[PDB]
Design an enzyme around this catalytic site. Structure first.
Site, PDB file in Angstrom:
ATOM      1  N   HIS A   1       7.344   2.337   0.312  1.00 16.57           N
ATOM      2  CA  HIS A   1       7.664   3.111  -1.386  1.00 16.57           C
ATOM      3  C   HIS A   1       6.882   4.069  -1.335  1.00 16.57           C
ATOM      4  O   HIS A   1       7.103   5.435  -1.669  1.00 16.57           O
ATOM      5  CB  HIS A   1       8.595   2.917  -1.885  1.00 16.57           C
ATOM      6  CG  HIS A   1       8.413   2.025  -2.523  1.00 16.57           C
ATOM      7  ND1 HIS A   1       8.853   1.059  -3.181  1.00 16.57           N
ATOM      8  CD2 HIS A   1       7.932   2.569  -4.200  1.00 16.57           C
ATOM      9  CE1 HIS A   1       8.274   0.101  -4.011  1.00 16.57           C
ATOM     10  NE2 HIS A   1       8.117   1.385  -4.320  1.00 16.57           N
TER      11      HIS A   1
ATOM     12  N   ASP B   1      11.551  -3.324   2.127  1.00 18.18           N
ATOM     13  CA  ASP B   1      10.316  -2.138   1.161  1.00 18.18           C
ATOM     14  C   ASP B   1       9.607  -3.126   1.501  1.00 18.18           C
ATOM     15  O   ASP B   1       8.729  -3.846   1.008  1.00 18.18           O
ATOM     16  CB  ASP B   1      11.155  -2.274  -0.349  1.00 18.18           C
ATOM     17  CG  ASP B   1      10.198  -1.272  -0.628  1.00 18.18           C
ATOM     18  OD1 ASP B   1       8.944  -0.564  -0.375  1.00 18.18           O
ATOM     19  OD2 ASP B   1      10.461  -1.192  -2.236  1.00 18.18           O
TER      20      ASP B   1
ATOM     21  N   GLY C   1       4.049   2.116 -11.763  1.00 20.86           N
ATOM     22  CA  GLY C   1       2.995   1.309 -11.099  1.00 20.86           C
ATOM     23  C   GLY C   1       2.330   0.067 -10.619  1.00 20.86           C
ATOM     24  O   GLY C   1       1.712  -0.506 -10.314  1.00 20.86           O
TER      25      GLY C   1
ATOM     26  N   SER D   1       4.533  -1.794  -8.187  1.00 22.58           N
ATOM     27  CA  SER D   1       4.877  -1.841  -6.766  1.00 22.58           C
ATOM     28  C   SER D   1       4.811  -1.702  -6.197  1.00 22.58           C
ATOM     29  O   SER D   1       2.621  -1.445  -6.282  1.00 22.58           O
ATOM     30  CB  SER D   1       6.052  -0.172  -7.077  1.00 22.58           C
ATOM     31  OG  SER D   1       5.526   0.734  -6.704  1.00 22.58           O
ATOM     32  N   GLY D   2       4.231  -2.449  -4.975  1.00 24.57           N
ATOM     33  CA  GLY D   2       3.754  -3.072  -3.981  1.00 24.57           C
ATOM     34  C   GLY D   2       2.854  -4.052  -4.475  1.00 24.57           C
ATOM     35  O   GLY D   2       2.240  -4.565  -3.093  1.00 24.57           O
TER      36      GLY D   2
HETATM   37  O1  LIG Z   1       5.857   5.367 -10.564  1.00 19.44           O
HETATM   38  C1  LIG Z   1       5.358   5.205 -10.158  1.00 19.44           C
HETATM   39  N1  LIG Z   1       5.057   4.302  -9.342  1.00 19.44           N
HETATM   40  C2  LIG Z   1       6.605   2.737  -9.150  1.00 19.44           C
HETATM   41  C3  LIG Z   1       6.751   3.397  -7.309  1.00 19.44           C
HETATM   42  C4  LIG Z   1       6.769   4.534  -6.789  1.00 19.44           C
HETATM   43  C5  LIG Z   1       5.277   5.279  -5.740  1.00 19.44           C
HETATM   44  C6  LIG Z   1       5.062   5.892  -5.478  1.00 19.44           C
HETATM   45  C7  LIG Z   1       5.865   7.165  -5.355  1.00 19.44           C
HETATM   46  C8  LIG Z   1       6.847   7.290  -6.255  1.00 19.44           C
HETATM   47  C9  LIG Z   1       7.097   5.822  -7.163  1.00 19.44           C
HETATM   48  C10 LIG Z   1       6.674   2.098  -9.419  1.00 19.44           C
HETATM   49  O2  LIG Z   1       5.407   1.456  -9.329  1.00 19.44           O
HETATM   50  N2  LIG Z   1       7.672   1.610  -9.559  1.00 19.44           N
HETATM   51  C11 LIG Z   1       8.400   0.612  -9.736  1.00 19.44           C
HETATM   52  C12 LIG Z   1       9.573   0.269  -9.505  1.00 19.44           C
HETATM   53  C13 LIG Z   1      10.507  -1.417 -10.560  1.00 19.44           C
HETATM   54  C14 LIG Z   1       9.917  -2.132  -9.982  1.00 19.44           C
HETATM   55  C15 LIG Z   1      10.753  -3.676 -10.233  1.00 19.44           C
HETATM   56 CL1  LIG Z   1      10.409  -5.569  -9.946  1.00 19.44          CL
HETATM   57  C16 LIG Z   1      11.266  -3.827 -11.907  1.00 19.44           C
HETATM   58  C17 LIG Z   1      11.420  -2.750 -12.312  1.00 19.44           C
HETATM   59  C18 LIG Z   1      10.673  -0.812 -11.533  1.00 19.44           C
HETATM   60  N3  LIG Z   1      11.132   0.008 -12.713  1.00 19.44           N
HETATM   61  C19 LIG Z   1      10.010   0.775 -12.660  1.00 19.44           C
HETATM   62  N4  LIG Z   1      10.554   1.789 -13.615  1.00 19.44           N
HETATM   63  N5  LIG Z   1      12.414   2.093 -12.901  1.00 19.44           N
HETATM   64  N6  LIG Z   1      12.141   0.876 -12.521  1.00 19.44           N
HETATM   65  C20 LIG Z   1       3.539   5.659 -10.143  1.00 19.44           C
HETATM   66  C21 LIG Z   1       2.611   5.273  -9.106  1.00 19.44           C
HETATM   67  C22 LIG Z   1       1.590   5.369  -9.439  1.00 19.44           C
HETATM   68  C23 LIG Z   1       0.868   6.122 -10.428  1.00 19.44           C
HETATM   69  N7  LIG Z   1      -0.144   6.247 -10.694  1.00 19.44           N
HETATM   70  C24 LIG Z   1      -0.926   7.422 -11.801  1.00 19.44           C
HETATM   71  O3  LIG Z   1      -1.556   7.758 -12.107  1.00 19.44           O
HETATM   72  C25 LIG Z   1       0.353   7.349 -12.927  1.00 19.44           C
HETATM   73  C26 LIG Z   1       2.069   7.632 -13.086  1.00 19.44           C
HETATM   74  O4  LIG Z   1       2.627   8.239 -13.745  1.00 19.44           O
HETATM   75  C27 LIG Z   1       1.588   7.263 -11.471  1.00 19.44           C
HETATM   76  C28 LIG Z   1       3.892   5.961 -11.558  1.00 19.44           C
END
Ligand SMILES: O=C(N[C@@H](Cc1ccccc1)C(=O)NCCc1cc(Cl)ccc1-n1cnnn1)c1ccc2[nH]c(=O)cc(O)c2c1
Length: 238
Positions: free
Chosen positions: A44, A93, A186, A188-189
Site C-alpha cells: 500500500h 500487503d 508513517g 507502515s511497511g
Molecule cells: O499516513 C501515512 N502512512 C500510512 C500508510 C500510507 C502510506 C502511503 C500513503 C498513504 C498511507 C500508515 O503508516 N498507516 C498505518 C496503518 C496502521 C497500521 C497498524 Cl499495524 C496499526 C495502526 C495503523 N493506523 C494508523 N492510523 N490508523 N491506523 C503517512 C506516511 C508518510 C507520511 N510522511 C509525512 O511526511 C507526513 C505524513 O503525515 C505521512 C503519513
C-alpha cells in the site's frame, strides 16, 4: 509508534526509511533489509507511485535529521507488488524493492532473517514494532526511530476485534487488550521483529489497524512466513 521509546543507534539495523522526492522530499514508509539488493515493505506504500525514480532508501538511520541533500541513499530499480494485492485490509500487503546498488553490510545496516516455515509453532514472546510514525492518530513524523514491545494476539482473538473484516491466516496481529502501544501513521511497511533463541526474525510487516493503539484493536501485520515462497520466486534473477 504510539507508547514507545527512542531506539538506540543501530539496534534495528534492518530498518530503513523509504523516502519519496515528490513533490518535495519526505518519509513515505518503513521497510526491512532482507538481502543485499532487497527491501521488504508494504504494497500500500506505493499508492499513486508511478515510477521507482522518485524513491530513495536510507539505511543506517536513527534520526530523520541525518538525511540532507548530501546524504547517500539507495536508488530503487524496481517495485514488485504481490499480484493479488488490492488493498491493505484485504491482505497480500507485501512488496519488494529491488535496489539499484548493493547494500554493504555493517553494524549499522544488515539483513533480518525471514521466518522459517518450521517456526509457525513457535510462541514469540519478545516482539517489537519500530518506525518514525505518529505518536498519536493525529500527529506527525518523528525524528528518532521509536520502538515498542507488543504481544502477538491469536488470529481468533484478533478476528473478534475486527468483525467487519476477514482476519486471514496470512495476517498476524499484535497489541494489548487495553491498547496504549501500537504502530501508527508513517510506520507502515516497517518490521514486526521477534527475538527467538538469540536470533531476530521478520515476523510481520506493519499493515493496518482501526486507529492507533486503541483498546481491543490490535495492529494487523502481513504474516511474512506465508510469503517466503513468493519472496524466493520474486528475488530470482531473470
Ligand atoms: O499516513 C501515512 N502512512 C500510512 C500508510 C500510507 C502510506 C502511503 C500513503 C498513504 C498511507 C500508515 O503508516 N498507516 C498505518 C496503518 C496502521 C497500521 C497498524 Cl499495524 C496499526 C495502526 C495503523 N493506523 C494508523 N492510523 N490508523 N491506523 C503517512 C506516511 C508518510 C507520511 N510522511 C509525512 O511526511 C507526513 C505524513 O503525515 C505521512 C503519513
Amino acid at each position: 509508534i504510539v507508547g514507545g521509546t527512542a531506539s538506540v543507534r543501530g539496534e534495528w539495523p534492518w530498518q530503513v526509511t523509504l523516502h519519496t522526492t515528490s513533490p518535495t522530499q519526505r518519509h513515505l514508509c518503513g521497510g526491512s533489509i532482507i538481502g543485499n539488493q532487497w527491501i521488504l515493505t508494504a504494497a500500500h506504500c506505493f499508492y499513486g507511485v508511478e515510477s521507482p525514480k522518485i524513491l530513495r532508501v536510507y539505511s543506517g538511520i536513527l534520526n530523520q535529521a541525518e538525511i540532507a541533500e548530501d546524504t547517500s541513499f539507495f536508488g530503487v530499480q524496481e517495485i514488485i507488488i504481490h499480484d493479488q494485492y488490492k488493498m491493505a485490509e484485504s491482505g497480500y500487503d507485501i512488496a519488494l524493492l529491488k535496489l539499484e546498488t548493493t547494500v554493504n553490510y555493517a553494524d549499522s545496516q544488515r539483513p533480518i532473517s525471514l521466518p522459517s516455515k518450521g517456526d509457525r509453532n513457535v510462541i514469540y514472546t519478545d516482539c517489537w514494532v519500530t518506525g518514525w510514525g505518529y505518536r498519536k492518530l493525529r500527529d506527525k513524523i518523528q525524528n528518532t526511530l521509536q520502538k515498542a514491545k507488543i504481544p502477538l494476539v491469536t488470529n481468533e482473538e484478533c478476528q473478534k476485534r475486527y468483525r467487519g473484516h476477514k482476519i486471514t491466516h496470512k495476517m498476524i496481529c499484535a497489541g494489548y487488550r487495553e491498547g496504549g502501544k501500537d504502530a501508527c501513521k508513517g510506520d507502515s511497511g516497517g518490521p514486526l521483529s521477534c527475538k527467538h533463541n538469540e536470533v531476530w526474525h521478520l515476523v510481520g510487516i506493519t499493515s493496518w489497524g482501526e486507529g492507533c493503539a486503541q483498546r481491543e484493536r490490535p495492529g494487523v501485520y502481513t504474516n511474512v512466513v506465508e510469503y517466503v515462497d513468493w519472496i524466493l520466486e520474486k528475488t530470482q534473477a531473470v
